Amino acid sequence: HAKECGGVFTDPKQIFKSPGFPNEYEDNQICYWHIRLKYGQRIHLSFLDFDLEDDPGCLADYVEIYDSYDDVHGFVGRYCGDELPDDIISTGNVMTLKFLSDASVTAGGFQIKYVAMDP
Ligand SMILES: [Ca+2]
Ligand SMILES: [Co+2]
């Protein structure tokens, strides 16, 4: 139980896993993680593991990161393949992660850490 993932996260620190990790993710997976810390705090995001389906535009499988509390504002990047994306630091107290896999081809998945940064 199961292909369940995401929600809102307000703790100082957490490691997000792709559903099933360390098993490969499944097809047709969508997950949203919304990080919200205290006003004045920022988010240091780091990639422990990253292995998704690869294609030139990441049109199939991807993890998207937003420097905001939605998946509309402050788009920082879209990632796939087996390269570890560089660390991401938020400009504010909010960050949004979206994972999507399409109908075919799976890979190892990911573990992504965030930690609070104080002023
Ligand atoms: Ca796929
Ligand atoms: Co606007």
PDB file of C-alpha atoms and ligand atoms in Angstrom:
ATOM      1  CA  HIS A   1       0.000   0.000   0.000  1.00  0.00           C
ATOM      2  CA  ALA A   2       1.306   0.990  -2.452  1.00  0.00           C
ATOM      3  CA  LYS A   3       1.674   3.538  -5.230  1.00  0.00           C
ATOM      4  CA  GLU A   4       0.844   6.069  -2.485  1.00  0.00           C
ATOM      5  CA  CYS A   5       3.220   9.024  -2.190  1.00  0.00           C
ATOM      6  CA  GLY A   6       3.482  12.719  -1.457  1.00  0.00           C
ATOM      7  CA  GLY A   7       1.663  15.332   0.556  1.00  0.00           C
ATOM      8  CA  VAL A   8       2.949  18.105   2.766  1.00  0.00           C
ATOM      9  CA  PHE A   9       6.157  17.977   4.783  1.00  0.00           C
ATOM     10  CA  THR A  10       7.055  20.456   7.524  1.00  0.00           C
ATOM     11  CA  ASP A  11       9.837  18.672   9.455  1.00  0.00           C
ATOM     12  CA  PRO A  12      13.438  20.013   9.642  1.00  0.00           C
ATOM     13  CA  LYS A  13      14.703  17.062   7.579  1.00  0.00           C
ATOM     14  CA  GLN A  14      13.374  14.218   5.426  1.00  0.00           C
ATOM     15  CA  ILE A  15      14.435  11.767   2.729  1.00  0.00           C
ATOM     16  CA  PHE A  16      11.879  11.164  -0.025  1.00  0.00           C
ATOM     17  CA  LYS A  17      11.925   7.843  -1.875  1.00  0.00           C
ATOM     18  CA  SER A  18      10.310   6.952  -5.181  1.00  0.00           C
ATOM     19  CA  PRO A  19       7.484   4.467  -4.535  1.00  0.00           C
ATOM     20  CA  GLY A  20       8.932   0.965  -4.190  1.00  0.00           C
ATOM     21  CA  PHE A  21      12.554   2.093  -3.643  1.00  0.00           C
ATOM     22  CA  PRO A  22      15.002   0.295  -3.717  1.00  0.00           C
ATOM     23  CA  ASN A  23      12.856  -1.590  -6.246  1.00  0.00           C
ATOM     24  CA  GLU A  24      12.259   0.059  -9.599  1.00  0.00           C
ATOM     25  CA  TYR A  25       9.345   2.486  -9.771  1.00  0.00           C
ATOM     26  CA  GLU A  26       6.221   1.464 -11.675  1.00  0.00           C
ATOM     27  CA  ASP A  27       4.625   2.908 -14.821  1.00  0.00           C
ATOM     28  CA  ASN A  28       2.016   5.692 -14.619  1.00  0.00           C
ATOM     29  CA  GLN A  29       3.301   6.949 -11.271  1.00  0.00           C
ATOM     30  CA  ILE A  30       2.703  10.536 -10.108  1.00  0.00           C
ATOM     31  CA  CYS A  31       3.890  11.968  -6.788  1.00  0.00           C
ATOM     32  CA  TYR A  32       3.866  15.489  -5.366  1.00  0.00           C
ATOM     33  CA  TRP A  33       5.935  16.496  -2.340  1.00  0.00           C
ATOM     34  CA  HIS A  34       5.349  19.980  -0.908  1.00  0.00           C
ATOM     35  CA  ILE A  35       7.873  21.225   1.637  1.00  0.00           C
ATOM     36  CA  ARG A  36       6.856  24.078   3.932  1.00  0.00           C
ATOM     37  CA  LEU A  37       9.139  25.283   6.740  1.00  0.00           C
ATOM     38  CA  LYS A  38       9.007  28.394   8.961  1.00  0.00           C
ATOM     39  CA  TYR A  39       9.172  31.909   7.451  1.00  0.00           C
ATOM     40  CA  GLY A  40      12.847  32.883   7.148  1.00  0.00           C
ATOM     41  CA  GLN A  41      13.989  29.287   6.622  1.00  0.00           C
ATOM     42  CA  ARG A  42      15.256  27.845   3.350  1.00  0.00           C
ATOM     43  CA  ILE A  43      15.492  24.329   1.934  1.00  0.00           C
ATOM     44  CA  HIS A  44      18.689  22.530   0.981  1.00  0.00           C
ATOM     45  CA  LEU A  45      17.748  19.728  -1.387  1.00  0.00           C
ATOM     46  CA  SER A  46      20.195  16.980  -2.315  1.00  0.00           C
ATOM     47  CA  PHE A  47      20.012  13.860  -4.464  1.00  0.00           C
ATOM     48  CA  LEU A  48      21.218  10.603  -2.907  1.00  0.00           C
ATOM     49  CA  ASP A  49      19.978   8.324  -5.677  1.00  0.00           C
ATOM     50  CA  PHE A  50      18.610   9.170  -9.108  1.00  0.00           C
ATOM     51  CA  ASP A  51      17.862   6.778 -11.974  1.00  0.00           C
ATOM     52  CA  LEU A  52      14.926   7.484 -14.292  1.00  0.00           C
ATOM     53  CA  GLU A  53      14.145   6.718 -17.912  1.00  0.00           C
ATOM     54  CA  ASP A  54      16.292   8.923 -20.138  1.00  0.00           C
ATOM     55  CA  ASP A  55      15.309  11.009 -23.150  1.00  0.00           C
ATOM     56  CA  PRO A  56      16.551  14.364 -24.599  1.00  0.00           C
ATOM     57  CA  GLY A  57      13.740  16.466 -23.066  1.00  0.00           C
ATOM     58  CA  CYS A  58      12.749  14.159 -20.181  1.00  0.00           C
ATOM     59  CA  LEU A  59       9.319  13.898 -21.804  1.00  0.00           C
ATOM     60  CA  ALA A  60       8.698  10.400 -20.454  1.00  0.00           C
ATOM     61  CA  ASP A  61       9.825  10.178 -16.800  1.00  0.00           C
ATOM     62  CA  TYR A  62      11.002  13.072 -14.671  1.00  0.00           C
ATOM     63  CA  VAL A  63      11.355  14.734 -11.315  1.00  0.00           C
ATOM     64  CA  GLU A  64      10.472  18.448 -11.408  1.00  0.00           C
ATOM     65  CA  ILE A  65      11.555  20.910  -8.705  1.00  0.00           C
ATOM     66  CA  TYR A  66       9.787  24.210  -8.022  1.00  0.00           C
ATOM     67  CA  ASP A  67      11.067  27.032  -5.819  1.00  0.00           C
ATOM     68  CA  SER A  68       7.480  27.628  -4.612  1.00  0.00           C
ATOM     69  CA  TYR A  69       4.535  25.884  -2.946  1.00  0.00           C
ATOM     70  CA  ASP A  70       2.993  24.906  -6.291  1.00  0.00           C
ATOM     71  CA  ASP A  71       4.122  23.320  -9.560  1.00  0.00           C
ATOM     72  CA  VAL A  72       3.575  26.602 -11.467  1.00  0.00           C
ATOM     73  CA  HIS A  73       5.888  29.209  -9.938  1.00  0.00           C
ATOM     74  CA  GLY A  74       9.676  29.182  -9.579  1.00  0.00           C
ATOM     75  CA  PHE A  75      10.463  26.204 -11.818  1.00  0.00           C
ATOM     76  CA  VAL A  76      14.086  25.288 -11.152  1.00  0.00           C
ATOM     77  CA  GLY A  77      14.457  22.121 -13.224  1.00  0.00           C
ATOM     78  CA  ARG A  78      13.296  18.869 -14.761  1.00  0.00           C
ATOM     79  CA  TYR A  79      15.477  15.811 -14.324  1.00  0.00           C
ATOM     80  CA  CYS A  80      15.722  12.273 -15.658  1.00  0.00           C
ATOM     81  CA  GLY A  81      18.408   9.780 -16.673  1.00  0.00           C
ATOM     82  CA  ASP A  82      20.974   8.366 -14.269  1.00  0.00           C
ATOM     83  CA  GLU A  83      22.967  11.539 -13.530  1.00  0.00           C
ATOM     84  CA  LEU A  84      22.635  12.912  -9.999  1.00  0.00           C
ATOM     85  CA  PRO A  85      21.186  16.414 -10.225  1.00  0.00           C
ATOM     86  CA  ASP A  86      23.194  19.090  -8.397  1.00  0.00           C
ATOM     87  CA  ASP A  87      21.965  20.301  -4.981  1.00  0.00           C
ATOM     88  CA  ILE A  88      19.065  22.743  -5.024  1.00  0.00           C
ATOM     89  CA  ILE A  89      18.690  25.567  -2.494  1.00  0.00           C
ATOM     90  CA  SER A  90      15.324  27.329  -2.217  1.00  0.00           C
ATOM     91  CA  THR A  91      15.052  31.142  -2.081  1.00  0.00           C
ATOM     92  CA  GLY A  92      12.173  30.848   0.423  1.00  0.00           C
ATOM     93  CA  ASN A  93      10.531  28.485   2.915  1.00  0.00           C
ATOM     94  CA  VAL A  94       8.736  26.445   0.227  1.00  0.00           C
ATOM     95  CA  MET A  95       9.660  23.769  -2.321  1.00  0.00           C
ATOM     96  CA  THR A  96       7.644  21.433  -4.555  1.00  0.00           C
ATOM     97  CA  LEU A  97       8.767  18.135  -6.046  1.00  0.00           C
ATOM     98  CA  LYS A  98       6.807  16.341  -8.736  1.00  0.00           C
ATOM     99  CA  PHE A  99       7.658  12.857  -9.960  1.00  0.00           C
ATOM    100  CA  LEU A 100       5.952  11.391 -13.004  1.00  0.00           C
ATOM    101  CA  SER A 101       6.532   8.163 -14.908  1.00  0.00           C
ATOM    102  CA  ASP A 102       4.739   7.453 -18.203  1.00  0.00           C
ATOM    103  CA  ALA A 103       3.199   4.222 -19.570  1.00  0.00           C
ATOM    104  CA  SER A 104       6.401   2.297 -20.349  1.00  0.00           C
ATOM    105  CA  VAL A 105      10.033   1.816 -19.214  1.00  0.00           C
ATOM    106  CA  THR A 106      11.000   2.069 -15.562  1.00  0.00           C
ATOM    107  CA  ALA A 107      14.294   2.538 -13.730  1.00  0.00           C
ATOM    108  CA  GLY A 108      15.808   2.417 -10.208  1.00  0.00           C
ATOM    109  CA  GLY A 109      14.123   5.601  -8.996  1.00  0.00           C
ATOM    110  CA  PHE A 110      15.408   8.084  -6.430  1.00  0.00           C
ATOM    111  CA  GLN A 111      16.124   9.177  -2.902  1.00  0.00           C
ATOM    112  CA  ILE A 112      16.003  12.933  -2.420  1.00  0.00           C
ATOM    113  CA  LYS A 113      16.876  14.656   0.850  1.00  0.00           C
ATOM    114  CA  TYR A 114      15.845  18.081   2.080  1.00  0.00           C
ATOM    115  CA  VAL A 115      17.094  19.891   5.182  1.00  0.00           C
ATOM    116  CA  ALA A 116      16.097  23.168   6.846  1.00  0.00           C
ATOM    117  CA  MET A 117      18.477  26.129   6.643  1.00  0.00           C
ATOM    118  CA  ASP A 118      18.258  28.845   9.319  1.00  0.00           C
ATOM    119  CA  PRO A 119      19.154  32.553   8.787  1.00  0.00           C
TER     120      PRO A 119
HETATM  121 CA    CA B   1       8.724   5.492 -18.248  1.00  0.00          CA
HETATM  122 CO    CO B   2       1.946  34.116 -11.412  1.00  0.00          CO
END
